[PDB]
RNA sequence: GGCACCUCGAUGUCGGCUCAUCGCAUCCUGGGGCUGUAGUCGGUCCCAAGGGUUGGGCUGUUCGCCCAUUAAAGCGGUACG
RNA sequence: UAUACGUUAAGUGGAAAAGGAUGUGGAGUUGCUUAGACAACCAGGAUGUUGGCUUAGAAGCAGCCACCAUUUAAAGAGUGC
RNA sequence: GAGUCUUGGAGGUAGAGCACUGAUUGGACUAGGGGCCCCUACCGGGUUACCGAAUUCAGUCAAACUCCGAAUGCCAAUGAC
């Protein structure tokens, strides 16, 4: 448990900037779909659209004790980091809908994350 | 982990009954079920809770302590709804039919083969190319389906005979 | 086929094989090798029979180091003969091995390859061996 | 395939014991074998 | 083949005949697993000793070759019974 | 049919070796791990991309570039069938 | 006469080692040339991947090899029991 200290102290600066974030389903992720969607994110902005999937709940509990006290109940749940570190997120909401409706990637248990104090219905 | 450490609920109509020498029985909406256990092992039940208290660790105690729990699980499941297993039948004309209570199968043999089940288990036939056994316990339907399958084992060169409801057989080539 | 060019005499007592190995009981010309846990008479064909396999399995990356050498000669009388009336005719050469002597050696290959090669060579010899690596302190 | 030395061939051969004997069972029945 | 412990005030050896009996490392019949087994025939391995296991030509012959059959024409011990 | 503590489950004891193996009793060395370990179940396992290459795609194992880096949550551009 | 304890001798076995006689493993140096070619035409040189006398580095053996070397056994001495 050495490098885990490193990553849990690194992600502070990562989570201390954004406003809006959204959650991705864990399973039913096609590497073909994964590369197409990550190249789509590539053609929009940088990799700031997180796909971090080494994300057991304890990094959440040791990272977001300051703000966003909701992920604890989504611990035993399909989790995949995806945040917004660029201009106001609406186009990412459109990509999310057109990726998550019925084709090759399921929404499932997705409910979004917090802007300042909110759970669902992002605009 | 271990399977002899999990928990087991008890539905409403399902009623277990403890007795001396650890010979638990069950009364349910589908029949009774009695099964004696090992005398040494301790069985203890609470409302919607099953417990198997194990004495000092040994080589055979860690085995019995899971065996009894698995058996109680199978028992409560069978008395709740029961088990079943179908039997696909490919043939090139191999067909089974019904006759009273027994079973008859016209496999490629030169005389009809008769199969009769014991009491407490029934053999239903939904169509002339499928057999489905139904019963309370699990070992009973298991043995009956095995004895029905062992009339005509599936030939590997081409699917021919009795086979389980969902299974893959290997295939060679003949010329 | 290994054998000495010249020798003093051509017949000789069979000797005895009690004790341990006087020397040669440490791998230093290489990295790995097989040790001897018992005492026997390694012949002249068993050595090359093991050597061909040991060098064929490997990819000639590392080179092998045979340490023993058939020196002592042994004889055998012709068949269907009574006892007595002289000593027999020389037949072949052998090599005396005592518990603890390092027989073969490999160096310049990896560890798993060396282990498997030495194991494949150990099945052609009449003794029970064990795999020993070079002393680390030197 | 009876032989006094049984050991898996492919990666998916298991090794079990029955009645005090050593058996190697697999899915490809060319590999099934029993010691002694 | 080796040795020379027993038998020199005596045991005489090979084939065939009459009669057999035992072992299994099974020739046939019985039950199985894998197969480079489509079927009919085969191969190799496992269990199995209950019964069965030929008539001639040549040679003193054991051995051996050949003819015609047979489900099969087993290998050995018993002072090479 | 003494006292005390252990070992063996084969009737080992109460006839053999090379070699084989999640039998069992010990003493160690040693990696990972309630930032969560192994199993099991729910996931996917190719993109300047099969790219320079070859009988036919060889598009994974005609068979030769260390047939490479990338998208990265991750891929040998194949572990085998 | 005998045993034992002190004291002194002769003698190269077990064991070890390479100081001599031989057998030998791998490196450095590999001399002087060896075959090929520049052409040894009449030089020298790249390899002789040297066949190899030297030496050296280390590493193994020996009933008819010793720079060494016991425990026993043997021969006496003056004292004691
Ligand atoms: Mg030395
Ligand atoms: Mg005599
Ligand atoms: Mg004598
Ligand atoms: Mg007598
Ligand atoms: Mg007489
Ligand atoms: Mg048999
Ligand atoms: Mg005539
Ligand atoms: Mg006779
Ligand atoms: Mg006899
Ligand atoms: Mg015994
Ligand atoms: Mg000596
Ligand atoms: Mg000497
Ligand atoms: Zn297999």
UniProtKB/Swiss-Prot annotation, chain A:
A GO term for molecular function: structural constituent of ribosome
A GO CC annotation given for this chain: cytosolic large ribosomal subunit
Domain of life: Bacteria
Induction summary: In response to low temperature and salt stress.
Disulfide pattern: none
GO biological process: translation
Keywords associated with the record: Ribonucleoprotein, Ribosomal protein, RNA-binding, rRNA-binding, Stress response
Family: Belongs to the universal ribosomal protein uL10 family.
Subunit-structure text: Part of the ribosomal stalk of the 50S ribosomal subunit. The N-terminus interacts with L11 and 23S rRNA to form the base of the stalk. The C-terminus forms an elongated spine to which L12 dimers bind in a sequential fashion forming a pentameric L10(L12)2(L12)2 complex.
Function of the protein: Forms part of the ribosomal stalk, playing a central role in the interaction of the ribosome with GTP-bound translation factors (such as IF-2, EF-Tu, EF-G and RF3).
Name assigned to this protein: Large ribosomal subunit protein uL10
Species name: Bacillus subtilis (strain 168)
Gene name linked to the record: rplJ
Residues of the full protein shown: 4 to 126 of 166
Swiss-Prot record, chain B:
Protein's UniProt keywords contain rRNA-binding: yes
Annotated GO MF terms: rRNA binding; structural constituent of ribosome
PROSITE patterns: RIBOSOMAL_L6_1
Gene Ontology, cellular component aspect: cytosolic large ribosomal subunit
Any one Gene Ontology BP term: cytoplasmic translation
Keyword annotations of the record: Ribonucleoprotein, Ribosomal protein, RNA-binding, rRNA-binding
Function of the protein: This protein binds to the 23S rRNA, and is important in its secondary structure. It is located near the subunit interface in the base of the L7/L12 stalk, and near the tRNA binding site of the peptidyltransferase center.
Subunit organization: Part of the 50S ribosomal subunit.
Family membership: Belongs to the universal ribosomal protein uL6 family.
Protein's recorded name: Large ribosomal subunit protein uL6
Species of provenance: Bacillus subtilis (strain 168)
From Swiss-Prot, chain C:
One annotated GO biological process: translation
InterPro entries with a match to the protein in the record: Ribosomal_uL16 (IPR047873), Ribosomal_uL16_bact-type (IPR000114), Ribosomal_uL16_CS (IPR020798), Ribosomal_uL16_dom (IPR016180), Ribosomal_uL16_sf (IPR036920)
Keyword Translocase applies: no
GO CC annotation terms, alphabetical: cytosolic large ribosomal subunit
Keywords: Ribonucleoprotein, Ribosomal protein, RNA-binding, rRNA-binding, tRNA-binding
Record's keyword annotation contains Transferase: no
Cysteines joined through disulfide linkages: none
Sample GO molecular function, one term: structural constituent of ribosome
Subunit comment: Part of the 50S ribosomal subunit.
Family, similarity comment: Belongs to the universal ribosomal protein uL16 family.
Record's function text: Binds 23S rRNA and is also seen to make contacts with the A and possibly P site tRNAs.
NCBIfam families, sorted: rplP_bact
Protein name: Large ribosomal subunit protein uL16
The encoding gene: rplP
Curated annotation (Swiss-Prot), chain D:
PANTHER family membership: 50S RIBOSOMAL PROTEIN L36, CHLOROPLASTIC, LARGE RIBOSOMAL SUBUNIT PROTEIN BL36C
Organism: Bacillus subtilis (strain 168)
Keyword annotations from UniProtKB, A to Z: Ribonucleoprotein, Ribosomal protein
Family stated for the protein in its record: Belongs to the bacterial ribosomal protein bL36 family.
Top-level taxon of origin: Bacteria
Family annotation (HAMAP family): Ribosomal_bL36
Complex and partners: Part of the 50S ribosomal subunit.
Cellular-component GO terms for this entry: cytoplasm; ribonucleoprotein complex; ribosome
Protein's UniProt name: Large ribosomal subunit protein bL36
Pfam families: Ribosomal_L36
Entry-linked NCBIfam families: rpmJ_bact (TIGR01022)
Molecular functions (GO terms): structural constituent of ribosome
Any single biological process term in GO: translation
UniProt feature coiled coil, ranges: none
SUPFAM superfamilies: Ribosomal protein L36
């Amino acid at each position: 448990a050495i490098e885990t200290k490193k990553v849990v102290v690194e992600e502070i600066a990562s989570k201390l900037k954004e406003s809006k974030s959204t959650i991705i389903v864990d399973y039913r992720g096609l590497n073909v779909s994964e590369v197409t969607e990550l190249r789509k994110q590539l053609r929009e902005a940088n990799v700031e659209f997180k796909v971090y999937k080494n994300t057991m709940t304890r990094r959440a509990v040791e990272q977001a004790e300051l703000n966003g006290l909701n992920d604890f109940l989504t611990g035993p749940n399909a989790i995949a980091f995806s945040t917004e570190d660029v201009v106001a997120p609406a186009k990412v909401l459109n990509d999310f809908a057109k990726n998550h409706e019925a084709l090759e990637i399921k929404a499932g248990v997705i409910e979004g994350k917090v802007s300042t104090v909110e759970e669902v219905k992002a605009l | 982990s271990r399977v002899g450490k999990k928990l087991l609920e008890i539905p409403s109509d399902v009623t277990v009954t403890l007795n001396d020498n650890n010979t638990v029985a069950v009364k349910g909406p589908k029949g009774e079920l009695t099964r004696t256990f090992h005398p040494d092992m301790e069985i203890k039940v609470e409302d919607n809770v099953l417990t198997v208290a194990r004495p000092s660790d040994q080589k055979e105690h860690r085995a019995l302590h899971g065996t009894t729990r698995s058996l109680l699980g199978n028992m409560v499941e069978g008395v709740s709804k029961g088990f079943e297993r179908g039997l696909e039948l490919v043939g090139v004309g191999y067909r089974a039919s019904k006759s009273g209570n027994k079973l008859v199968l016209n496999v490629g043999y030169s005389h009809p083969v008769e199969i009769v089940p014991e009491e407490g288990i029934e053999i239903e036939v939904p169509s002339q190319t499928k057999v489905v056994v139904k019963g309370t316990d699990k070992e009973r339907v298991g043995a009956i389906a095995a004895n029905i399958r062992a009339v005509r084992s599936p030939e590997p060169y081409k699917g021919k005979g009795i086979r389980y409801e969902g299974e893959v057989v290997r295939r060679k080539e003949g010329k | 086929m290994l054998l000495p060019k010249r020798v003093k005499y051509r017949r000789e007592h069979r000797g005895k094989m009690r004790g341990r190995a006087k020397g040669g009981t440490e791998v230093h010309f290489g990295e790995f090798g097989i040790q001897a846990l018992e005492a026997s008479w390694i012949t002249n064909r068993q050595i090359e029979a093991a050597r061909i396999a040991m060098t064929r399995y490997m990819k000639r990356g590392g080179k092998v180091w045979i340490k023993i050498f058939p020196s002592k000669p042994y004889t055998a009388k012709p068949l269907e003969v009574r006892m007595g009336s002289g000593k027999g005719a020389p037949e072949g050469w052998v090599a005396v091995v005592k518990p603890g002597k390092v027989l073969f050696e490999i160096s310049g290959v990896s560890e798993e390859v060396a282990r498997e090669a030495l194991r494949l060579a150990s099945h052609k010899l009449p003794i029970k061996t064990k795999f020993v690596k070079r002393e680390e302190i030197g | 395939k009876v032989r006094p030395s049984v050991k898996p061939i492919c990666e998916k051969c298991k090794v079990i014991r029955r009645k005090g004997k050593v058996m190697v069972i697999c899915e490809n029945p060319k590999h099934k074998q029993k010691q002694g």
